[PDB]
Amino acid sequence: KYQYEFPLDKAGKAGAVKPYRGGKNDFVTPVSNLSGVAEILTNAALKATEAYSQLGQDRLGAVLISKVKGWAYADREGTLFIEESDNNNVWTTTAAVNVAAGVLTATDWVYLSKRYYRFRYVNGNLQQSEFVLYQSVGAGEMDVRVNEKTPLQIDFAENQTHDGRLKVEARKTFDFVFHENAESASEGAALPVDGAAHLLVEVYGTAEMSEVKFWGKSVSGQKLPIRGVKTDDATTASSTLGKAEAWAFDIKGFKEIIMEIISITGGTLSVKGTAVS
Amino acid sequence: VKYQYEFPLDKAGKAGAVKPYRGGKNDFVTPVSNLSGVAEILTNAALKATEAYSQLGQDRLGAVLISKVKGWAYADREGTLFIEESDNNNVWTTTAAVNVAAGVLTATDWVYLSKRYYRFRYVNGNLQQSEFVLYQSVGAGEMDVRVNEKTPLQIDFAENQTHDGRLKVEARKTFDFVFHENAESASEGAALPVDGAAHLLVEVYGTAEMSEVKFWGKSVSGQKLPIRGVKTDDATTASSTLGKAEAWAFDIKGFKEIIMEIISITGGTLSVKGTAVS
Amino acid sequence: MVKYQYEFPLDKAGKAGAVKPYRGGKNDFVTPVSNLSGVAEILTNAALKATEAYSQLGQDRLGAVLISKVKGWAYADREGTLFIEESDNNNVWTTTAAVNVAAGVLTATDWVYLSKRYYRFRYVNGNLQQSEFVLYQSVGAGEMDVRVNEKTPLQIDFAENQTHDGRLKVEARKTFDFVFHENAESASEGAALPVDGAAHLLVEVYGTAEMSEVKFWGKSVSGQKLPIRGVKTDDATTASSTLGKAEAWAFDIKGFKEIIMEIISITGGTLSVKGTAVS
Amino acid sequence: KYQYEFPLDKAGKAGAVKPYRGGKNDFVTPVSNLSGVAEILTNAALKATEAYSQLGQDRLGAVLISKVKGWAYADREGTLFIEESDNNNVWTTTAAVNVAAGVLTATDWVYLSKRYYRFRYVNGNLQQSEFVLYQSVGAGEMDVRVNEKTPLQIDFAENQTHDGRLKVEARKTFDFVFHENAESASEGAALPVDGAAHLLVEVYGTAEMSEVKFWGKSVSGQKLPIRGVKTDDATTASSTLGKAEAWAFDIKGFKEIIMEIISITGGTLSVKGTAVS
Amino acid sequence: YQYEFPLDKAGKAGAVKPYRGGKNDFVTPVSNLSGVAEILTNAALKATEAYSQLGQDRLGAVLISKVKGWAYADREGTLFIEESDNNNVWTTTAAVNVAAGVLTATDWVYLSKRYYRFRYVNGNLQQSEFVLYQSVGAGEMDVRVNEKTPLQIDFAENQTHDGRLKVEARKTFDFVFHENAESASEGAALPVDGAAHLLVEVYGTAEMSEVKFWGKSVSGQKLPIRGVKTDDATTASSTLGKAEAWAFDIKGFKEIIMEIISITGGTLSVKGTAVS
């Protein structure tokens, strides 16, 4: 017999309900998810350095336990361990929380992975005169629909922002091979520009003599001479007879870039670059 | 079979599946769980080496409309748990597959079902089990919810969508535009809508023996204003050209429209096409 | 009238309840529940002739349970079409959703959020007689307030249409037009462009005025006017003012608070000064 | 007494449950939050311009009412008012919704603040022959944890985007005081660059003579001369003897910028700027 | 009470409502306990008089996580939500002014200590009407949001500017090529990693020194690069000087090297900032 009393309906029928609406002419069953219920594991005061160990709790049964939370109160300091075991014999510690003297201490919800869970409480160097340890468990996952015309109010971790701004990377890089160890004249491979703005082209190899002609393609598909800027001396040219050098191009608006070996003698030539946004 | 739980009695001696609460334990509440938290044990029969357990097909269609299924397996030896679906309860397709290591509780994800029938199928590995249990949970339905907006929820981007803690973004857009296609007479041709583009590359090409293209933008008044372009081959700056088989780069920031007008043309055709970039 | 194979467990005193035991000792109880959205009614399992229709009687949403939404499942050995329909008068129907039901394939509708008073399912069989057919209907109601408690940030995912090569598509550029002067017929500073993070400005000067002088100004922190230089589009002239018209001037305005195009003098008609600022 | 029938378990016991699983060997209680339940307030047809007024409903009781929603159906047009009162005597309208002839009309959920709520319905200029008015109420707030390992797929409002692209602002602006009404030589305050790329500096005041020297600091902390471009004539210099003028600086890669007054006579000088990203 | 449980077809009472067109299905209306309230008091207080609820232990079969209050009075007062670990010494968690004749609600207060209570202090006028209600909650349901269905987000006001998301696209890092070098070496190679601009400072006691400016692209061979000196806009691929800074366009490079070719009569440092 408890202190609560179930109310009666108009015909004298008891129910675990509350009345509502202005005339108290409707009924509703008050409920709590099982995550809101708690079991008291122990209130036995521990000696200095003495431990309480809950018997292994099997998660597997009619209710499939997914998670566990603890509350500890003691008049002296100790440590609450949440532990897990796949064999109910060898235990690993999933969480450990300091329980200060005279301070209600709560764990987080711990999402379980192994088959068995337990609480283990180790008292500190002073004898408790007062101790309670409570355990809650939960289960399952309900589908929910957020109102389509009520946006979720979001913001970003302070680590993902600077001065209230989201940190973004707008620049992308990719390398491209026009020619690798070419030993004769050819256009080689055409770089697809794909929104890139800037291109750095390296010309290098054993070739005693070589000529590289700088080309872009726009809408017609015909090759158009483009000018590059040589890194060492700022020479601007639409071709080179040289090597062990690099050329910078503004390629905004082009569809393709071609570095054509027009002629080559007495060795090989590689033509490779990096395109940037 | 009586369990160790006992329903409490109210003040009038009435049993209920309730717990007391408030300081004086003078109120009651029914503990509940959505059915997604309930599980059925499918089998605990130990399998021989390579032997399979197959659940009979479960019809999703019923008084309770099953939307999703989740499994747990524990075995002292290794095996594989398959979640399968069938529209005819005869031919099975595998929706999910999980390796179950020896002595390790293994869980599937929630699998959202599409076909009419679902089942678990467990294939034991090369060693006979001495201990095996397989649990199945199902869910149904969808609760409409209004999220209390007192504090925003913190969101994050996939590690695949970030680089050095930065969100990867593409700010640049590209579009091609035809000013003139095989024009055989003088006209302004089509006006490019700038729409926040910053840079334009214009190619002039065709059979025309002679042609003049004049470079224009429009700002707020709608009157044509001469603009200057830079020719790709020699870095010539000009507001028009008598040439072809050439391309001209323009800064178009702030313009509403760009026009490449053929002023004159003889002895063939001329195309004028470009690519605008932001 | 109706006895199933489920069995209610007993408490320590032998009392049945619609509960499951839990905790290691099975010394606690919990009532398994499902929101009504998870429950279904079978509307029909009567096999239809070729082209024959099933029409559910209009369902009134208004009642002790206020129906907000409806979802359907259909299975048939032959192809057909499932319609979710609505009516304010239970007589004239509009189709809210229609789904093709392939032969031998469980077909689900979306949840349909209802607006009219009455809802129904209508199923029209295709050109082959069914030998097997079931049609299920689920309904829901209400809206629960919730508080979302997260221990980690929520991970977000973008539509494939919102991304390109694993990058979020963004527009960083904004454009706005501004009127400094419209058909001015006398000298004045006119209106001050608020720069507000814009970087580039194009200014057009046009009108009937026979003579005019426009002076180019920016304001920084003090609010004192500072002469600024523009580049004329037609010939790349750089200047801090103009006596001309039917011309446009490009300005780098990074760091300025305001831009002013002052008509210093004007005779023999009117003058407009208008521009576009770009970020 | 209704057409539904409670099923029986294997031992013949009735329950407000449904069977589930393949063998129908498990049970579940179908539930609805009370927000899904409705009361019919009235079906009494109104004269032209006649009102229905619900008696004030007290939110305070065993169920604490948080919110209210209405549905109205009538063969003629009218207006549904949701009203609140702190004294159950003076009524303020929180929401008013037009109810068209022959069209089910729903309000939004209205979150209540005063002690009492009611519906008031005012019929239009034509006598009703058919009218029903339904009220739903809610209460409370459930704590929930959203699945931490599953991405939410989100979609941007058309107002958040342009041509399918998310609208972003990459540029930031901040004002900085190097000197305010200085009347003597000093370095003044050092601008922290913090990723800014461009600086506009204004020099102004009564000083008869002044020299301002333009400095940046890199990693060592030593001052390095920098060059600015004067806005009116494009003069490039690392210092100025002038005032009522402004200087533009490229500050990319600098840690700090200093506008040093080297000398000043016969009045005061202010040096202020705007840094941009 | 005025409510009546309906009967099923066999005459069985239940806390249910009928539904579907034929009223041939049943459902149990429920409310989470957070929707339920207890009336603590309706005893009218004298001027300045206080009501104090006895300490409520959160620890029990139902583990109380949170509490919310409503107060109504015909005269003004103050509602305090308080917490205690010992049910003796109280700290105030929340305080809400209650205006005359105005229903006043607290927020949900998420409890930390073992015991909670409401304390109400009446103002300077005797109440003739007063009620005080208390709701509690417990637990936390795991949920899957909008599994098949796209949802909209809205950005924090702090992250937005004229309807645009504020982003920082520019990143900065400092790099040491050389610190107090006393002999010739390449020093450390800056990884460019998408940086576009580099500022390099050269400083120290060295009487004489040469720094050569290098980039590496795809081949891995050093390529001469040109810098612009901050003081006079000199362009060069090397310097014999110090107490100077050089700006480089490094777009497209993989690495940057500031090589000390020679050094006499002291030390030299070479340090920079790379930006995107």
Numbering used by the authors:
A (entry chain E), D (entry chain B): 3 to 279
B (entry chain C): 2 to 279
C (entry chain A): 1 to 279
E (entry chain D): 4 to 279
What does the paper say about this structure?
In order to elucidate their role in the lytic cassette of B. subtilis prophages, we cloned and produced XepA from the PBSX prophage and YomS from the SPβ prophage. The putative lysins XepA and YomS align very well, with a sequence identity of 38% (54% similarity) covering 85% of the overall sequence. In summary, we show that XepA initiates cell death in vivo, whereas YomS has no effect.
XepA crystallized from several conditions in multiple crystal forms. The crystal structures of the two highest diffracting crystal forms are reported here. Comparing the XepA structures in different crystal forms, only minor differences in the overall fold can be observed. A superposition of the whole pentamer of XepA crystal forms I and II resulted in an r.m.s.d. of 0.9 Å. However, using only the C-terminal pentamer disc of the different crystal forms to calculate the superposition matrix (r.m.s.d. of 0.3 Å), the molecule shows a domain motion in the tunnel and N-terminal disc corresponding to a rotation of 2.1°. Comparisons with viral portal proteins show that the XepA tunnel has a relatively small diameter of approximately 10 Å, which suggests that it is too small to allow the entry of any DNA molecule (dsDNA, 20 Å; ssDNA, 15 Å).
